[PDB]
Amino acid sequence: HHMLKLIVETKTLVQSLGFASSVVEKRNVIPEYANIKLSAKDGNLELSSTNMDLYLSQKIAVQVVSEGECTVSTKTLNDIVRKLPDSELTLTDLGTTGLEIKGKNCKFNLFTLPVSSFPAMDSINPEASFKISCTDFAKIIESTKFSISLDETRYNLNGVYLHIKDKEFCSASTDGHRLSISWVTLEKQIKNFGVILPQKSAEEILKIVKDPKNINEDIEILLSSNKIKFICNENTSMLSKLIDGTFPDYSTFIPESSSSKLVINRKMFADSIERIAIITVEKFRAVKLSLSRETLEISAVGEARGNAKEVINSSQDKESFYEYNSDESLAIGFNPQYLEDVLKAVKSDVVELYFSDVSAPVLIKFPENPKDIFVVMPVKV
Amino acid sequence: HMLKLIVETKTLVQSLGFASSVVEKRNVIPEYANIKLSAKDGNLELSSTNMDLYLSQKIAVQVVSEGECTVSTKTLNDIVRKLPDSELTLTDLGTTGLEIKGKNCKFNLFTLPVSSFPAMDSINPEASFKISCTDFAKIIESTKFSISLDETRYNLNGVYLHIKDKEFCSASTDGHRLSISWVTLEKQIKNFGVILPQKSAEEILKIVKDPKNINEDIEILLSSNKIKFICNENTSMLSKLIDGTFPDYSTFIPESSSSKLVINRKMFADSIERIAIITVEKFRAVKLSLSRETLEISAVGEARGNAKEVINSSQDKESFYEYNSDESLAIGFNPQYLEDVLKAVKSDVVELYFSDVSAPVLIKFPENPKDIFVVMPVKV
C-alpha cells in the first residue's frame, strides 16, 4: 500500500549513510548483507541500522511526497549516493522494481528486503537518565577510549566504564597498565550507577556527538542494567548492549602523594618521545626519562638496532617549557605509546607529570583541565 | 676512512623514500633491507637492492671524511623523517655504529660490513638512447595498467619496451585489452625490446615523476638480460627482465570500423564508474546502448539491482556526445578496462571506434596521436 517517495538533499543523505554504515562496520568493512531501513513519515526520513550489539536511528528533514518504509543494502546505497552529482535525489519505492534512486540523468534500482524482517529498536527501562552537553560528552570519551584493553579475553576492560559518582558523570578506562579518568558535573542528583560501554559503541557515539550539527548541542543518556541509550540532539538515537563484567576498583590506583613534579611543553615532550621510541623493538617498547632540574634526557635502546638520546634543557619559554623541581635525579621508564596516548588526548600548552619512585606510576594532569586524570605504570629500564 | 658528512634533511628524506619503496616485495618484511651509504667527491651515494633491481642515488652533501657504511633502510628512513633539523650530520663512529646527529639529539644505528653489501652488476647494451622524463612517464602511464597479473603468463607479465624504426614504444596486454604508447626518437637505433617487470616499471615511474627529474631526461640501456635507467644523471636503476617473448600485437589493432563515438572523456568515465557500482565480481560488465540521439549506459547485478544513465547528444564541450550511425549498437565491456584507458590520458574528448557487438573497440584520444588502446567486449 504505502510506497515511500521523498526528495532529499544529497549531502545530508551522504552524511547519514556514513553514520549508518560506520555503526555496523565489523572490521573496516560493511557486512555485505547489512540492511538499512528507510522510513518516510511526517516530514522526515528515519534511517535505521543495527546489528546484534548496536541500533542507530537517524531522522533527517526531507520532502516527504508519499509515506512508506523499505529496506535495502546499506553498502550499496552508501556507495551509489556518494557518486551522484545532483544536489538533490529522489527516492521512490517502486515495488518489484526495487527502491529507485533517481538523479537528473541516472536511475538505480536496488532490490528491497521486507520491512517485516527488520528489527525494531528495543525498549529501555532506564535506571538513570540525564542530559549533558555534547562538548562535555565528547571530552570524557576522547580522554578515555585510548586506554581500553584491546584484549577481548579481558571482557570487563574492552570498554569504558560510564558511571555516576555523586553529582559527577565519569568515564574510566584501564588495560592493566594505565588508567584514564574524565568526568563532568551533573546538575541533579542521580542514583549512582555504572555500566561498561563496548569499544565500538564508544567510538561510534563519539563520532556522532562530534558532528558539526551536534557538537554544540546536548546528549541525553539513559542507563539500565543491560542497555544504554544515547539521544544526541533529539534526532539521533543509539542503543547499545553493555559488557557483562565488573570494572576494577580504580580508587587506590591514583597516587595520593608525589615526591617530584615535571612541567613540560606538551608537543615538545610528545614529539621527542616519538622520535626516540623509533629505535625500540616490540619485545621492549620503553623509553627512559632521565629527569633532573637542569635537563631531561629521553633515551631508548633497541636490541640489534641501536640506541637514541634527546636532551631537553630547562626553559621558562612557553614553546620549550621544562621545569623539574627536585635536587634528586630520577631515571624512570615508560612504554612510549602510553605516554603519547595521554599527551595526544588533551590540547594543552604544557603537561604536568607527578612522580614518586622508579617503580611507582606517574600521575599526569593538564592545566585548565581539572576533570581529567591519567595514571601510567612504569617499566624497568 | 670513516664516513662523515653534513646533509640537507629534506633531500635525504626524499632519497630514503625511494630506497624504501624500490625493494618492496611480497612476503618480505621491510625490516630486512640494508642501505649502503658512500661518501665521495662531494656526494652521498645511497645504494638499495634486492633480487630484481639495484638502485643507486647520488645527492650533493658536504663530505667531511670519505667512507662507506651500511645500515637498516627502514630504521634510517623512519628516524630521518622525524628530525626537525634543516641539516643532519652522519658520522660512522665505528663500534657504536652510524651516528645521526641533530640539535640536541643523537641516534646510533648498528652497521653491517660494506664487504657484505652487493655491488651493482654491469650491462652490455644492444640499444642505448635518451628521452625526456615526461615522455617516459607518459608511455608507462599509458601501458602499466593492462599487463597480465598472472605470473605464469610470463611474456604478458610486464610492459614490453621496444624500439621500432625510430619509435620507442611500450605495449602491454592481458589477453582482454591492448595498450600501446610511443614517442619518436631523434636518432635511428637498432630494433630491440625487453619486458620490464611491473614493480620495476612502478619504481622507475616514481623516480621520473619526482619534481627534480620530471623536466629532465632519462637514459635507457636495453640488453638481453637487463635494462638500465639513468634518470637525470644522478639516479641509476638496473632491473632484471621478464623472461618471455611479447606477442606480435600490431595486427590486433582494428583497421576498419562501422561506427564512431565521440564523447567527453570525464563525462563518460564518471558515468561508467557510477553505473558499474551495481555489478558483481562474477559479471563485471556495463552495456553501452549507442544511438545518434542517446547513449544509455546500463548494468545489472544479480540479487542487487540494476542501473541506467542516459547521455544525450550534445555539441557542448563539457557534455559532448556524437554518434555517427543510423543503426543502434548494444555492446558490453568490463567497466574497469574502459576506466583504465579513460583515466590514463587526461584529454577532454575521446573517440571509440566500433564494428559489431563481438569486435573489440579501438580507443583514441584526438589530443594524443601516439597512444592506442584496444578493448575486447563482453556479452551483455
Side-chain angles (χ1 to χ4, degrees), chain A residues 2-10 12-25 29-51 53-154 156-165 168-186 192 194-212 214-250 254-255 257-281 284-343 345-346 348-379 381, chain B residues 1-25 30-31 33-150 152-153 155-164 166-185 189-211 213-254 256-280 283-345 347-378 380:
Chain A
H2 283 293
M3 308 304 288
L4 172 152
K5 187 177 183 82
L6 63 91
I7 299 161
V8 58
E9 189 177 2
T10 305
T12 303
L13 183 63
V14 167
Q15 265 265 92
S16 304
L17 293 183
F19 288 108
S21 294
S22 173
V23 84
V24 293
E25 276 166 23
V29 174
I30 316 168
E32 177 184 347
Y33 64 82
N35 297 133
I36 184 173
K37 177 165 85 165
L38 305 174
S39 183
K41 191 173 178 58
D42 294 332
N44 287 278
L45 167 63
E46 185 177 1
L47 306 83
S48 296
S49 182
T50 182
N51 60 21
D53 304 313
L54 270 179
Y55 199 110
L56 179 70
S57 166
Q58 301 173 85
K59 279 192 182 189
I60 60 174
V62 305
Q63 297 177 240
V64 177
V65 174
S66 181
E67 157 186 9
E69 309 186 293
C70 64
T71 86
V72 294
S73 166
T74 305
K75 180 178 194 308
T76 301
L77 181 62
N78 191 52
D79 282 352
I80 290 170
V81 173
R82 298 175 63 82
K83 288 293 190 303
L84 292 179
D86 309 76
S87 65
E88 296 186 324
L89 298 174
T90 305
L91 306 194
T92 312
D93 186 356
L94 297 177
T96 54
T97 297
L99 175 71
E100 180 190 73
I101 301 101
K102 180 165 62 166
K104 176 176 153 58
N105 304 119
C106 63
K107 292 176 175 174
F108 298 78
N109 299 307
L110 282 53
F111 297 143
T112 58
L113 287 312
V115 170
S116 60
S117 305
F118 196 93
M121 176 172 46
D122 290 336
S123 63
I124 181 164
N125 192 33
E127 306 294 300
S129 125
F130 62 95
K131 300 174 65 164
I132 57 172
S133 71
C134 287
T135 287
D136 286 347
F137 185 67
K139 190 267 289 175
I140 73 170
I141 303 297
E142 204 77 75
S143 283
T144 55
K145 72 175 190 71
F146 59 82
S147 46
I148 82 125
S149 180
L150 304 181
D151 187 356
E152 63 178 347
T153 76
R154 301 187 79 170
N156 58 329
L157 306 187
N158 305 138
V160 296
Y161 179 48
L162 299 179
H163 55 301
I164 313 265
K165 265 167 73 183
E168 313 277 357
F169 179 51
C170 311
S171 178
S173 64
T174 185
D175 65 355
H177 307 278
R178 61 238 173 95
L179 171 73
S180 303
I181 307 172
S182 192
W183 63 100
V184 57
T185 309
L186 297 192
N192 282 22
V195 304
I196 305 170
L197 181 71
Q199 173 194 348
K200 176 61 171 178
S201 304
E203 285 162 355
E204 293 303 303
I205 192 60
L206 180 59
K207 288 180 276 186
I208 288 160
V209 301
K210 286 166 73 176
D211 188 272
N214 300 324
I215 188 52
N216 300 131
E217 303 302 326
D218 295 316
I219 177 165
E220 177 172 30
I221 303 179
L222 300 85
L223 296 169
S224 83
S225 177
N226 64 345
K227 292 167 181 124
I228 183 172
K229 185 166 183 184
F230 303 104
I231 309 187
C232 176
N233 189 24
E234 305 295 328
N235 290 324
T236 302
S237 292
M238 196 186 85
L239 190 58
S240 184
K241 292 185 167 56
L242 301 171
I243 292 192
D244 180 44
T246 302
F247 195 75
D249 181 83
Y250 62 86
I254 300 171
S257 66
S258 302
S259 49
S260 70
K261 182 182 182 176
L262 165 68
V263 181
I264 190 169
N265 179 285
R266 181 189 64 96
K267 173 182 166 56
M268 181 183 69
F269 192 30
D271 290 348
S272 187
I273 293 165
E274 176 185 36
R275 212 176 274 125
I276 295 299
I278 293 166
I279 200 65
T280 62
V281 294
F284 181 44
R285 295 286 182 198
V287 295
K288 178 190 290 185
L289 309 178
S290 293
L291 296 147
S292 76
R293 196 182 298 276
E294 296 78 11
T295 63
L296 160 60
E297 302 187 351
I298 304 179
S299 64
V301 299
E303 178 175 280
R305 302 188 64 195
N307 54 69
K309 179 177 57 70
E310 181 157 10
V311 176
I312 292 170
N313 294 308
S314 58
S315 170
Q316 292 291 308
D317 300 335
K318 187 179 79 166
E319 336 79 63
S320 60
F321 197 88
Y322 176 86
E323 179 149 37
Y324 186 74
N325 65 355
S326 184
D327 290 345
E328 230 178 302
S329 297
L330 177 66
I332 185 171
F334 293 96
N335 186 322
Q337 192 55 53
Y338 297 166
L339 298 183
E340 292 180 71
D341 283 346
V342 172
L343 297 170
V346 178
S348 170
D349 287 349
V350 307
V351 59
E352 307 176 324
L353 281 79
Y354 296 81
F355 302 93
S356 51
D357 62 271
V358 296
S359 73
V362 64
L363 168 66
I364 304 176
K365 301 184 184 176
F366 300 84
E368 284 190 281
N369 295 266
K371 305 186 183 165
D372 295 88
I373 286 175
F374 309 89
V375 186
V376 180
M377 292 285 283
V379 300
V381 288
Chain B
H1 279 335
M2 308 298 287
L3 179 152
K4 184 182 175 184
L5 63 89
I6 300 174
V7 53
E8 178 171 9
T9 306
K10 75 176 185 176
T11 306
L12 181 60
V13 167
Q14 283 304 107
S15 300
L16 293 174
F18 293 108
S20 299
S21 60
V22 82
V23 296
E24 290 171 346
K25 296 272 296 182
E31 285 78 358
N34 302 126
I35 187 171
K36 181 178 54 184
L37 307 180
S38 178
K40 176 72 191 164
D41 297 328
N43 295 316
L44 170 62
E45 180 184 11
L46 303 93
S47 297
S48 303
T49 186
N50 64 23
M51 63 178 183
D52 306 311
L53 43 72
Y54 200 109
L55 184 67
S56 168
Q57 305 177 80
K58 285 182 180 185
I59 59 178
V61 306
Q62 286 306 301
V63 176
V64 184
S65 180
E66 290 188 342
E68 305 187 302
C69 65
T70 81
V71 295
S72 167
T73 305
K74 175 166 166 50
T75 301
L76 182 55
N77 187 64
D78 290 354
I79 291 171
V80 170
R81 292 182 65 86
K82 294 292 179 187
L83 291 183
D85 306 78
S86 67
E87 292 177 339
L88 297 175
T89 304
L90 308 179
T91 312
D92 185 359
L93 293 176
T95 47
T96 56
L98 177 69
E99 177 191 79
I100 307 167
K101 175 166 59 181
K103 186 191 172 182
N104 305 120
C105 68
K106 290 180 184 171
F107 303 78
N108 294 312
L109 283 62
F110 296 158
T111 59
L112 289 181
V114 172
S115 67
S116 297
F117 194 96
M120 194 192 281
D121 281 351
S122 184
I123 182 172
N124 267 2
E126 304 269 2
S128 312
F129 59 96
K130 292 174 55 167
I131 58 170
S132 70
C133 290
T134 51
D135 280 358
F136 194 53
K138 174 210 77 125
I139 73 175
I140 299 302
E141 285 181 344
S142 285
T143 57
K144 68 184 192 68
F145 57 82
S146 50
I147 69 165
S148 175
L149 295 184
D150 184 337
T152 67
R153 301 206 65 181
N155 44 243
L156 304 192
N157 194 24
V159 292
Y160 177 48
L161 299 181
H162 56 297
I163 300 287
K164 279 203 303 183
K166 271 194 172 180
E167 320 299 325
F168 180 51
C169 185
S170 182
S172 63
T173 187
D174 61 356
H176 307 296
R177 60 246 177 90
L178 169 72
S179 305
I180 309 164
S181 188
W182 68 100
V183 299
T184 302
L185 303 179
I189 285 126
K190 173 171 160 166
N191 277 26
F192 194 81
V194 302
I195 305 169
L196 182 70
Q198 177 187 348
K199 173 63 165 177
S200 302
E202 292 168 339
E203 291 301 308
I204 192 66
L205 179 60
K206 291 185 280 188
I207 288 158
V208 301
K209 289 176 74 72
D210 188 82
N213 302 324
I214 185 54
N215 301 133
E216 307 299 340
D217 294 326
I218 178 165
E219 184 172 14
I220 299 177
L221 310 192
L222 310 179
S223 77
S224 38
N225 67 349
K226 61 199 85 166
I227 178 169
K228 186 174 185 178
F229 303 106
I230 306 179
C231 177
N232 189 23
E233 308 295 329
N234 295 131
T235 303
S236 296
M237 197 185 91
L238 192 64
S239 179
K240 296 185 178 166
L241 309 171
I242 303 292
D243 186 21
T245 296
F246 197 78
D248 189 287
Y249 63 83
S250 61
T251 72
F252 294 97
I253 303 162
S256 74
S257 81
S258 53
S259 71
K260 180 189 185 174
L261 165 67
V262 182
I263 191 173
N264 176 282
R265 178 194 65 85
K266 174 183 203 303
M267 176 182 71
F268 189 37
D270 288 351
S271 179
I272 293 165
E273 172 184 54
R274 61 192 153 244
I275 295 298
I277 292 168
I278 203 65
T279 63
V280 303
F283 178 53
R284 292 289 188 202
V286 296
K287 176 189 293 187
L288 309 181
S289 295
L290 298 145
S291 69
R292 172 172 289 113
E293 298 77 10
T294 64
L295 160 62
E296 299 185 352
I297 304 181
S298 67
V300 302
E302 188 191 317
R304 300 191 68 198
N306 52 71
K308 173 173 61 66
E309 178 154 18
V310 176
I311 294 169
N312 295 294
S313 70
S314 166
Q315 291 291 304
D316 297 325
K317 161 172 158 159
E318 330 80 81
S319 56
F320 197 94
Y321 175 90
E322 180 164 359
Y323 185 70
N324 71 348
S325 185
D326 296 337
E327 285 77 45
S328 301
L329 175 64
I331 186 174
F333 293 93
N334 183 327
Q336 193 57 48
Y337 298 168
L338 298 181
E339 290 182 61
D340 281 348
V341 171
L342 299 170
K343 293 179 201 244
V345 179
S347 309
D348 271 7
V349 78
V350 60
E351 304 174 328
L352 281 75
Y353 295 82
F354 301 100
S355 289
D356 58 280
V357 293
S358 71
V361 66
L362 168 61
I363 306 178
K364 295 176 162 182
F365 302 84
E367 204 167 321
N368 309 81
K370 295 185 187 188
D371 289 271
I372 287 174
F373 312 89
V374 184
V375 182
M376 293 293 298
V378 301
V380 288

